[PDB]
Design an enzyme around this catalytic site. Sequence first.
Site, PDB file in Angstrom:
ATOM      1  N   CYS A  61       8.897-108.613  -8.178  1.00 33.75           N
ATOM      2  CA  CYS A  61       8.119-107.677  -9.016  1.00 33.75           C
ATOM      3  C   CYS A  61       8.295-106.239  -8.560  1.00 33.75           C
ATOM      4  O   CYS A  61       7.757-105.830  -7.532  1.00 33.75           O
ATOM      5  CB  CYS A  61       6.633-108.046  -9.050  1.00 33.75           C
ATOM      6  SG  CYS A  61       5.683-107.151 -10.276  1.00 33.75           S
TER       7      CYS A  61
ATOM      8  N   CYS B  95       8.556-101.416 -15.500  1.00 37.16           N
ATOM      9  CA  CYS B  95       8.920-102.787 -15.170  1.00 37.16           C
ATOM     10  C   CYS B  95      10.176-102.698 -14.328  1.00 37.16           C
ATOM     11  O   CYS B  95      11.244-102.325 -14.830  1.00 37.16           O
ATOM     12  CB  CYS B  95       9.178-103.598 -16.442  1.00 37.16           C
ATOM     13  SG  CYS B  95       9.674-105.349 -16.134  1.00 37.16           S
TER      14      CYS B  95
HETATM   15  O1  LIG Z   1       9.245-106.028 -12.049  1.00 38.13           O
HETATM   16  C1  LIG Z   1       8.192-105.583 -12.585  1.00 38.13           C
HETATM   17  O2  LIG Z   1       7.843-104.379 -12.377  1.00 38.13           O
HETATM   18  C2  LIG Z   1       7.395-106.497 -13.435  1.00 38.13           C
HETATM   19  C3  LIG Z   1       6.137-106.279 -14.022  1.00 38.13           C
HETATM   20  C4  LIG Z   1       5.833-107.431 -14.725  1.00 38.13           C
HETATM   21  C5  LIG Z   1       6.865-108.310 -14.565  1.00 38.13           C
HETATM   22  N1  LIG Z   1       7.801-107.741 -13.788  1.00 38.13           N
END
Ligand SMILES: O=C([O-])c1ccc[nH]1
EC number: 5.1.1.8
Lengths: 310, 310
Positions: free
Chosen positions: B236, B88
């Site tokens: 993300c 994450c």
């Molecule tokens: O930032 C990330 O890798 C992530 C995965 C799910 C929510 N954030």
Amino acid sequence: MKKITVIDSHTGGEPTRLVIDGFPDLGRGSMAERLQILEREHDQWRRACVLEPRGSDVLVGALLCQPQAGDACAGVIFFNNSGYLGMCGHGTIGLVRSLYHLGRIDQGVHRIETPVGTVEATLHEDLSVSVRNVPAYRYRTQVMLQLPGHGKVHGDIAWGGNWFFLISDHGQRIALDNVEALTHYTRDVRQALEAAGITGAEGGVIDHIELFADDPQADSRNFVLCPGKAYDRSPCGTGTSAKLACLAADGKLAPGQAWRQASVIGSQFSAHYEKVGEQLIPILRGSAHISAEATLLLDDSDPFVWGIGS
Amino acid sequence: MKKITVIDSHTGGEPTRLVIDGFPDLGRGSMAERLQILEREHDQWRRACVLEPRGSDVLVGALLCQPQAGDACAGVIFFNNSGYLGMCGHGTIGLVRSLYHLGRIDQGVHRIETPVGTVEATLHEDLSVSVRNVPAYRYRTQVMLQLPGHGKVHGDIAWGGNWFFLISDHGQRIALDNVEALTHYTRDVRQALEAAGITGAEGGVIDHIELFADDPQADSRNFVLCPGKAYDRSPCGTGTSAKLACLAADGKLAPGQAWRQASVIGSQFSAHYEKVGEQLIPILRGSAHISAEATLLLDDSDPFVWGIGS
Ligand SMILES: O=C([O-])c1ccc[nH]1
Ligand SMILES: O=C([O-])c1ccc[nH]1
Ligand code: NA
Ligand code: NA
């Protein structure tokens, strides 16, 4: 980092963020006068406290205030993701349970000042709280509304400490797994109200919508759309108060008779009313539980220090 | 009564709940082995930590663990409203910034063990964090997908620390005011993937869906649907990692070249990759800010002590 000290609780799943220190000073006026100052001068603080990322769209905040009356144990101003509330039933239960948690009150009778009047809360031996709310009444009955795609619905307009539209003939399924459809339905209802110029007394904006249905384990189950389009996880203290006024006026509930209201997620309040003069006094009982002790930290370098979004 | 001590932070608006005390002991195995134990024996604790009422559907949790390797500063297990993550990116940035807040690390380079391997984070002088993530790669390209009501779309299947389906030809408007339609669209995309039996390597469930679009102030803007149907408020980290692998394979980004990815709410990561062997190493930079210091309290009398709902 400015700090905001809070006790987070929930009442039947509906959260209350009780602010016990850190907000700007609002003076020594009534709770209603302090609300005006909070909104006009310090609304960024509401947003910091209850919007993403430090809060959530579901969250209701309650600013603890020193009351004007010597015989009151507290004053409070309630707010949510979109603005300010009047009274707040689940929120008052949360406040009292939180004061008990902090060791500031014991079991017994307490008076709490709000922007719409003083309420009386009883903290019981089982730590549930009965709230003797401000007076409730029905303003209009079976007001017709045309819902595009659904057709005609009829609702009551009633005051329970906030303004509600109450509907029984909606034909919607009331359950947690259907909150998406229920949210859309009630949003359409509020739209239709706004379109047709339908208000409460003195042009009161009807910003809460509630749907009612039968329940195998209670007298009724409800779904309640709050002003900011989040739903109430609780049976809604002011919403249930409005319901008592409607039942009474229809000849369906007498003074002192218990009424069990279930929420969309299955939590329950028990309620009855007393008659004082021409006025109907709704009394709601439920329980809150402490969720967290927290200190919110407001970093000046955070682009969302005052909350995300519009 | 039971207490869970946390540092809440957010990375570009996406929250991380870092649990620093209170969870059950998971043994001395690898982070992957501890995840197995956490899910099997203690999944109620995940639910208490991140579901309503004490959490939110949006929330990602991060359990701080003592790492196995002597040169690692920490181990972590990440989870959300639906289950467990692999790596994450936003959560790692939050973890590092939170450890600094706690005074447990200073600026510099730190190794963090995760269930999918060890990552390297650098805490910079400006307190932003660069994460050198696990290797990323594209598994399949331009996989065709029929969308009832839309139809048809093409997407890449890629690993960036979780499994993603990446789409550019979706025809959807990517902005915060459109997250409702974007959520439905990506839900259908995932529905369609499951229908056709489409997975990642070795039957890997593709549980994150991301749509990409042009942006006037970044190379791209995205919308990312997480496994539990909440969207990522950040660009993300693992999602952008997958994107780098796709860009590289298409001949559109070379090693060391900067890629600026904006999120649906306008926050940004800067990213580039390095090439080692046949492997692509994605490196993501962003900033987290502390949201709150909190102690969650788990009341045995609370019906929702282990969280609300299915
Ligand atoms: O930032 C990330 O890798 C992530 C995965 C799910 C929510 N954030
Ligand atoms: O319990 C209430 O009165 C209430 C109003 C809005 C949310 N909860
Ligand atoms: Na019944
Ligand atoms: Na651009």
